[PDB]
Nucleic acid binder design. Structure first.
Lengths: 87, 131, 65, 92
RNA sequence: GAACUUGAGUGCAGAAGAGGAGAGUGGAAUUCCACGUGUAGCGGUGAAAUGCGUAGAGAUGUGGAGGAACACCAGUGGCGAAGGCGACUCUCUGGUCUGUAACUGACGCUGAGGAGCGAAAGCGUGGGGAGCGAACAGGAUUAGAUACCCUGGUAGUCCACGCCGUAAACGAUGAGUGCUAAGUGUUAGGGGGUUUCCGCCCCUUAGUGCUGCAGCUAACGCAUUAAGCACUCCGCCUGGGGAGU
């Protein structure tokens, strides 16, 4: 994940000017990493070590989504639409 | 992660006591502070200071040793634990070391010793033994 | 002994600098150990990479004879 | 990103051929969206050991800034050519 | 329900690393092939023999073919969850550590069942095959020798895909958290103290070793990397065989 792409994501999803810690922001960064990493694994199918990194990312994302849904259901629903998640 | 702050505070005292430290600093909470106050009133610790800060505060406890550097607190046990709560009836409130020690019960009247709670015919959660 | 690179303020060891590199290889071409040359741990690793690059590019020998 | 390409031209060529080689391969790098920051030429040095029965060669040192694609293309062509006897791409 | 920032995470700034996958490249050495020089043994053992050699061996020089592994560096050194990872270069890619206090504000821990990974041997299909080498053959040894030793040598070791899912898979030590003398090496950082520096000294994190209080242990020993003091969750034990049947 390049730095300019990351700046796009954080600005697009941040809840306010200085916000970088919000669930929304974190889930956006993770979602790109997860998608980006999936593409790498499609070619390097046997890279089991890297894949373990993906599994932690997937767990982190689920926990942030679970937190958001329980905190404020509205915010949660908006985010999964913008990101196109099935959750 | 931290699961029983009360137990952790008791252990800080037990460990510090074991090596005859003069003072120890415990991160504060309302319930831990009440327990500390009982220990002073009952003469198990010398003094207790409450230091404020941005965070949750610190309890500085000064331990108490007799002549010959003898430890006043012989032992501390956590009774009620996060994994298995212990509630006592008014008449079943335990005496500790045959009345030579105290038990700290959380009641709707407050956080009392065994003796105090017994006089009020009140029960509740048995937090710890101290002897 | 003291590390040559920390003394002289050498931040970047380079495989091209053959004259410098040659101070760390034996008569036979063996890379001298850190215990014998007094180099810092960090710089021994960087130096080892340089010698291996140099040997690949025919600046240093693999086996002198 | 900054790379340092060093390569060795076989020593049995005239200066005309040499310049031809340098121009050809520098054009390859630039052709693939690189920019050549530096270009040293150590000139004919004595090789530490024989390569393809050659004890000498002309050492070139081209610094460039490029993406993967550009440096990878040099590697492919530098291997195929019989004039360049060794090369190394190195990130700076 | 509303707040808070220490836990946890994000941002920002740095650091090291045989972490992984893919694609290339390099030097040594063994074997084989060709040729020059050259002649009678070479090889092997406790001692021998089998074996190879006048059909020119072994030794020696030049070149070439091919496969496997990466001397020195190299270090109770590093990285990884574990198995494990050590030539160099490039592509893709995971994690950890340090500082910062810009942001979220308990979002955390454990985790039956489940899923994925998991040395070596082994299996299926197809490649590859130098060295090594179960099986096997021969020579010895021996009372015998279905072995140790010697000369050969198949599968295998290697590669792609799939399967197998077991190890003394070990620290014979589950994961998380906090607390409880010191001394001393060593790895990657940060801050400072006299400075161009070097460096010495001081402090601080996070790992990795040794010694050693308190405490623990049947003893041996462990001891801030606990086998100490505590709390949460999981797994497992209940005499030896029968039987991991």
């Amino acid at each position: 994940i390049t730095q300019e792409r990351k700046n796009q994501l954080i600005n697009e999803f941040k809840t306010h000017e200085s916000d970088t810690g919000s669930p929304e922001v974190q889930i956006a960064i993770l979602t790109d990493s997860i998608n980006n990493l999936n593409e790498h694994l499609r070619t390097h199918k046997k890279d089991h070590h890297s894949r373990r990194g993906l599994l932690k990312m997937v767990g982190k994302r689920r926990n942030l989504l679970t937190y958001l849904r329980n905190k404020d259901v509205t915010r949660y629903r908006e985010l999964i639409n913008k990101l196109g998640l099935r959750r | 992660v931290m699961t029983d702050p009360i137990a952790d505070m008791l252990t800080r005292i037990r460990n510090a006591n074991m090596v005859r430290h003069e003072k120890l600093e415990i991160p504060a909470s309302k319930l831990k502070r009440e327990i500390a106050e009982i220990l002073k009133r009952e003469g198990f610790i010398r003094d207790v200071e409450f230091v404020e800060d941005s965070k949750q505060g610190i309890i500085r406890v000064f331990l108490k040793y007799g002549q010959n550097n003898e430890r006043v607190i012989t032992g501390l046990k956590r009774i009620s634990k996060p994994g298995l709560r212990v509630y006592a009836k008014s008449n079943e409130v335990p005496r500790v070391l045959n009345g030579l020690g105290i038990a700290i019960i959380s009641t709707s009247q407050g956080v009392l010793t065994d003796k105090e709670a017994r006089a009020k015919q009140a029960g509740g959660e048995v937090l710890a033994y101290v002897w | 002994k003291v590390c040559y690179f920390t003394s002289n303020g050498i931040t970047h060891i380079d495989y091209k600098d053959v004259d410098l590199l040659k101070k760390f290889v034996s008569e036979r071409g063996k890379i001298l150990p850190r215990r014998v040359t007094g180099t810092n741990a960090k710089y021994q690793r960087k130096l080892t990479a340089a010698i291996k690059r140099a040997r690949q590019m025919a600046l240093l020998p693999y086996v002198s004879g | 990103r900054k790379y340092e390409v060093m390569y060795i031209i076989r020593p049995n060529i005239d200066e005309e051929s040499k310049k031809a080689v340098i121009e050809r391969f520098n054009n390859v790098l630039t052709s693939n969206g690189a920019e050549i920051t530096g270009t040293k030429d150590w000139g004919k040095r004595r090789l530490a050991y024989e390569i393809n029965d050659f004890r000498d060669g002309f050492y070139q040192i081209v610094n460039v800034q490029s993406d993967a694609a550009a440096v990878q293309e040099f590697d492919r062509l530098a291997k195929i050519s019989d004039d360049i006897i060794r090369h190394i791409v190195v990130k700076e």
